[PDB]
């Protein structure tokens, strides 16, 4: 059934699974028209499909052209997401296809289930976790590739960089969710923390800076301060 | 006018014949029901006074044979049987009538209720869902499960209702996933009406048949089927105008006849609220919506 705090280590066992987040698939700016009405303009989006054990990220870029002449876009976005995830699965060798797909929003369950009818043995699961994957577009390199795309495009990343050489998947996922939670609660502060020290750089083939083990502990501590803070600044405590 | 005689009534029992029901006391001199209208299917059904568990009964059509009821003390129930000796049967019936040991099927002349509930229900068609080919009548009870229930265990005792499943390859054309899930017209009109049922008459009859088994026997799988067939129509943007008009009449009389005190279990809030207020056909069921709002405004 649903994925929650109780069954959390299942993410890091040896059954292939993907998280799918559709938050950033349909993205708009809202603006005024010459007549003083309101209109939306779409910008490029992305599906965030992530293997939490390996860090492999299948970033399907959603170009604004896919919405042209369509109605009820928020609803279409869920079905387009399910179509693209189903296409991804079919593109993978049988031994790489997931055994479970966990959707971060419950409204993806039926669209994905219908698109995956050919795969009755792939479990489609919700989650009770409030995961911060919407903040993926706060990672500069991911945002850049989405905004520059001129056509539909899939781009493959490892969202853990090389961390798995030194830490376990569980620890890597915990670091990722903390970084993304921070970027979601206060993007400017989060990014300041990550870059304050000009001597620590982001490798061309990485997303995050090349912190030593010690510096990660400092960084992680600064991100938890930020999150508790903003939680004060927000609630006054 | 036809007759279903009873050999005897050895155990106290409430007997239903269609929408009517009366009480028979243990060893009361009761020998059957007469004046049963010809031209309709009928159901005769039983609830024992000592064990309200298991309502059970028999669908039949007097045009297809001479039928009677006889209690079996080994299996502990009233059984329907066919008498093949026509002279013997007329004799039995005439003697019981002369002794006025039969109750009078109380049809009021103004009253079209039973016709309206069974307009597309036929004994030969009923046999395709309740399989027991050696008899002309069909047994149903509270506990019997449907073929679809058996998929999610004795197949000879199953209701082979047509299986409907909105998240199934049969319902969803490859490449039309969103279209077909949100507008079920192709599943209704091509898959079900043109391919399986053959026409609207067969679709309506199974739907009427499902309701009556839910109402008279509390058969949960039949209730699921009735709501499933209804939802499939209401969730189709493209339905023949004649079907919608007839559906509104069918459901009106079904809601009209439902015991007020059983609405809690026999009516699915989600289906009805979706059908009457959200679906494509939200404006096409005027009589049904009016009776639902005046009789069960709580469910909504
Ligand atoms: C069997 C095939 C699907 N058409 C017939 C339909 O099932 C049906 C119709 C009327 C009934 F009283 C019972 C069942």
Q: Concatenate the DSSP letters of all residues of B132-148 into one string.
A: -TT-SSEEEETTPPBHH
Residues A180 and A91 occupy one common structural domain: no
**Burial profile B54-81: b = 16 or more Cβ within 10 angstroms, e = fewer:** ebbbbbbbbeebbbbbebeeeeebbebb
CB B85 within 8 A of CB B13: no
CATH number for the domain harbouring residue A198: 1.20.80.40
CA–CA gap between residue A160 and residue A175 (Å, rounded): 9
CA–CA gap between residue A231 and residue B157 (Å, rounded): 62
- How open is the CA angle B99-B104-B108, to the nearest 5 degrees? 155
Split into its structural domains, chain A has a count of: 2
CA–CA gap between residue A78 and residue A23 (Å, rounded): 9
For residue A201, the enclosing domain spans: 164-237
CB B59 within 8 A of CB B73: no
Residues A61 and A158 occupy one common structural domain: yes
Residues A171 and A99 occupy one common structural domain: no
For residue B291, give the nearest of B256, B249, B244, B242 by alpha carbon.
Answer: B256
- Other CB atoms within 10 Å distance of the CB of residue A140: 13
CA–CA gap between residue B91 and residue A191 (Å, rounded): 99
Strands (E), chain A: 17-21, 27-32, 38-43, 45-50, 56-62, 100-103, 123-125, 153-158
Residues A59 and A107 occupy one common structural domain: yes
Six-digit token string for B208: 């009427």
Listed residues A143, A163, A183: the one ending a domain: A163
Contact call for B177 and A111, based on CB within 8 A: yes
CB B285 within 8 A of CB B274: no
- A58 in any annotated domain: yes
Listed residues A106, A131, A163: the one ending a domain: A163
Residues A211 and A125 occupy one common structural domain: no
| Long-range contacts, stretch A184-192, CB < 8 angstroms, 24+ apart | A184/A132, A184/A134, A184/A135, A184/A138, A185/A226, A185/A227, A185/A230, A185/A231, A186/A226, A186/A229, A186/A230, A187/A135, A187/A138, A189/A226, A189/A230, A190/A138, A190/A223, A190/A226, A191/A138
Residues of B in contact with A110 (CB under 8 A): 167, 181
- A2 in any annotated domain: no
The closest CB to that of B167, out of A79, A82, A113, belongs to A113
Residue positions counted in chain A: 237
CA–CA gap between residue A176 and residue A84 (Å, rounded): 24
Residue positions counted in chain B: 300
- Can you count the helices (H) and strands (E) in chain B? 12, 10
Describe the crossing of helices B241-257 and B200-217 by its angle, rounded to 10 degrees. Answer: 10
Q: Is the CB of B162 under 6 A from ligand 1?
A: yes
**Burial profile B110-122: b = 16 or more Cβ within 10 angstroms, e = fewer:** eeeebebbbbbbb
Listed residues A130, A147, A163: the one ending a domain: A163
Residues A138 and A227 occupy one common structural domain: no
**Residue in the structure block whose two tokens are 């919608």:** B244
- Other CB atoms within 10 Å distance of the CB of residue A190: 23
Specified resolution (Å)? 1.6
CA–CA gap between residue B63 and residue B1 (Å, rounded): 10
User: What distances in angstroms separate CA A182 from CA A14, A136, A176, A225, B75, one per listed residue?
Assistant: 29, 11, 10, 9, 71
User: What distances in angstroms separate CA A86 from CA A22, A90, A97, B180, one per listed residue?
Assistant: 14, 6, 10, 17
Q: Residues of A near B (CB-CB distance < 8 A)?
A: 76, 79, 82-83, 110-111, 113-115, 117-118
CB B44 within 8 A of CB B69: yes
Q: B205, B210, B214: which to mutate for ligand 1, most atoms within 8 A of CB?
A: B205
Residues A37 and A140 occupy one common structural domain: yes
Six-digit token string for B119: 């307009």
Contact call for B168 and A117, based on CB within 8 A: yes
Give burial (CB, 10 Å; 0-12/13-18/19+) of B294: exposed
CA distance B179 to chain A (A): 10
By what technique were these coordinates determined? X-ray
CATH number for the domain harbouring residue A65: 3.30.420.230
User: What distances in angstroms separate CA B295 from CA A53, A195, B56, B256, B261, one per listed residue?
Assistant: 56, 68, 28, 9, 11
- Other CB atoms within 10 Å distance of the CB of residue A6: 9
CB B38 within 8 A of CB B1: yes
């Amino acid at each position: 059934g649903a994925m929650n705090s109780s069954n959390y280590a299942e993410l890091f066992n040896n059954d292939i699974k993907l998280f799918v987040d559709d938050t950033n698939v349909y993205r708009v700016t809202v603006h005024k028209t010459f007549e003083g009405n309101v209109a939306t303009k779409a910008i490029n989006g992305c599906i965030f499909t992530l293997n939490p054990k390996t860090g492999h990220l299948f970033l399907k870029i959603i170009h604004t052209s896919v919405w042209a002449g369509q109605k009820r876009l928020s609803q279409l976005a869920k079905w387009k997401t399910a179509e693209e995830v189903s296409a991804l699965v079919r593109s993978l060798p049988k031994e790489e296809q997931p055994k479970q797909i966990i959707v971060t929003r419950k409204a993806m369950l039926d669209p994905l289930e219908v698109h995956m009818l050919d795969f009755p043995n792939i479990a489609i699961r919700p989650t009770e976790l409030r995961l911060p994957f919407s903040a993926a577009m706060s990672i500069d390199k991911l945002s850049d590739v989405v905004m520059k795309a001129t056509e539909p495009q899939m781009v493959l990343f490892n969202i853990y960089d090389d961390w798995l050489d030194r830490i376990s998947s569980y620890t890597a996922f915990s670091r990722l969710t903390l970084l993304l939670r921070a970027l979601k609660t206060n993007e400017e502060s989060a990014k300041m923390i990550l870059l304050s020290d000009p001597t620590i750089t982001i490798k061309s083939y990485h997303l995050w800076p090349s912190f030593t083990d010690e510096q990660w502990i400092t960084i992680e501590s600064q991100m938890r301060d930020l999150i508790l803070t903003e939680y004060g600044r927000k609630y006054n405590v | 006018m036809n007759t279903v005689p009873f050999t005897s009534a050895p155990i106290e029992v409430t007997i239903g014949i269609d929408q009517y029901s009366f009480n028979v006391k243990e060893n009361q001199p009761f020998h059957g029901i007469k004046d049963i209208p010809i031209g309709h299917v009928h159901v005769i059904h039983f609830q024992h006074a000592d064990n309200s568990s298991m309502r059970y009964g028999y669908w039949f059509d007097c045009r297809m044979g001479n039928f009677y009821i006889q209690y079996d003390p080994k299996d502990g129930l009233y059984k329907m049987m066919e008498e093949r000796d026509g002279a013997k049967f007329e004799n039995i019936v005439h003697n019981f009538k002369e002794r006025q040991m039969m109750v009078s099927y109380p049809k009021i002349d103004e009253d079209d209720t039973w016709y309206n509930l069974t307009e597309f229900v036929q004994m030969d068609k009923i046999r395709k869902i309740v399989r027991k080919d050696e008899n002309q009548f069909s047994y149903v009870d509270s506990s019997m499960t449907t073929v679809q229930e058996n998929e999610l265990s004795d197949p000879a005792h199953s209701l082979n209702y047509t299986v409907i499943n909105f998240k199934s390859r049969e319902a969803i054309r490859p490449g039309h996933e969103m279209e077909d899930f949100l507008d079920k017209s192709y599943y209704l009109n091509t898959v079900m009406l043109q391919g399986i049922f053959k026409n609207s008459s067969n679709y309506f009859g199974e739907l009427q048949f499902a309701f009556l088994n839910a109402m008279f026997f509390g058969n949960y799988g039949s209730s699921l089927q009735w709501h499933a067939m209804i939802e499939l129509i209401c969730s189709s943007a493209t339905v023949p105008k004649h079907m919608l008009d007839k559906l509104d009449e069918i459901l009106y009389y079904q809601i009209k006849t439902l015991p007020e005190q059983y609405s809690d279990i026999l009516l699915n809030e989600r289906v009805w609220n979706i059908c009457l207020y959200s679906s494509f056909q939200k404006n096409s069921l005027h009589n049904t919506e009016k009776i639902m709002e005046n009789k069960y405004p709580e469910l909504l």
